[PDB]
């Protein structure tokens, strides 16, 4: 078996009900709310409503096919922890108009009041977008990575659903100053993305545990679409270049 799929399975990856299984060879995931791994990429894939599709290869080339209506959609490859000091590389083949193509992931610390919204946070690294949830939060700071020029913001998600279940959480995010281009490499240095939330206070709790009630504080590349306006398709190769 793949490394992360054995490291996963190890550590009691299987006691989520959504998790489903480890795909040797490539799958397309259609419902509601699952997890998994297809080769050693696990993946992430939920909504909450309308018809979205996640199509997955055991070398992280990925597609996410989406319908038109009155939904929200986030899936999309990556690991099942989040580590910060990850470099995630990416190239972006194709988008129809994603509300993010975004790196996305979860924290939570099962030891911190649920009264303190930084007990569980959801976070974004947004690279393309039609959304800009720079409406939605508080300014953190300005801040360059891989030559590049992000900008932070917190939000609040108030009763949503989460890792968790139903919770109210914080939300950090890092939009850059322009969308990213497709068919060119670019890479996430995710360390500088926590250096910069923590340079505000915002501080990301537990990035590796099966602590939460319903996912693993996963981390993946991720296409997000809300309220979709038409049908899409967006795509892309995400891989591991860490330093090691
Ligand atoms: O893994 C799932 C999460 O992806 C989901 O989180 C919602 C996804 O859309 C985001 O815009 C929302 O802020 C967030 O509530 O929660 C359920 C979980 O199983």
């Known amino acids: 078996m793949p490394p992360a799929v054995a490291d996963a399975k190890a550590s009691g990856i299987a006691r989520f009900n959504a998790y489903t299984q480890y795909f040797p060879e490539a799958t397309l995931i259609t419902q509601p709310h699952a997890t998994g791994h ?3 990429f696990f993946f992430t894939h ?11 290869d055991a070398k992280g080339n990925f597609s996410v096919s989406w319908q038109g209506g009155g939904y929200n959609y986030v899936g999309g490859p990556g690991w099942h922890f989040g580590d910060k000091n990850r470099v995630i590389g990416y190239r972006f ?3 129809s108009g994603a509300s993010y193509i975004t790196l996305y992931g979860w924290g939570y610390d099962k030891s911190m009041p649920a009264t303190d919204p930084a007990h569980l946070v959801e976070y974004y690294i947004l690279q393309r977008w039609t959304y800009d949830p720079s409406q939605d939060g508080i300014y953190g700071k300005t801040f360059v990575s891989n030559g590049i020029e992000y900008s ?3 939000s609040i998600r ?3 659903p989460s890792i968790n279940g139903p919770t109210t959480f914080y939300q950090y995010w890092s939009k850059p100053s322009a969308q990213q281009e ?3 490499d670019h890479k996430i240095i995710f360390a500088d993305h926590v250096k910069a939330w923590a340079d505000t206070g915002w501080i990301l709790p537990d990035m590796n545990n099966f602590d939460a009630s319903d996912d693993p504080t996963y981390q993946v590349l991720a296409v997000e679409v809300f309220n979709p306006q ?3 398709t967006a795509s892309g190769q995400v ?6």
């Not at 891989?239 to 090691?244: A, I, L, M, V």
């Open 230 to 232: 038409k049908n899409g």
């Open 93 to 95: 083949n194709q988008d």
């Open 38 to 40: 297809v080769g050693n």
């Open 182 to 184: 497709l068919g060119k």
């Open 158 to 160: 108030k009763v949503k």
């Open 152 to 154: 932070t913001y917190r």
């Open 46 to 56: 939920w909504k909450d409503g309308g018809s979205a599709a996640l199509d997955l």
């Open 239 to 244: 891989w591991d270049e860490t330093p090691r």
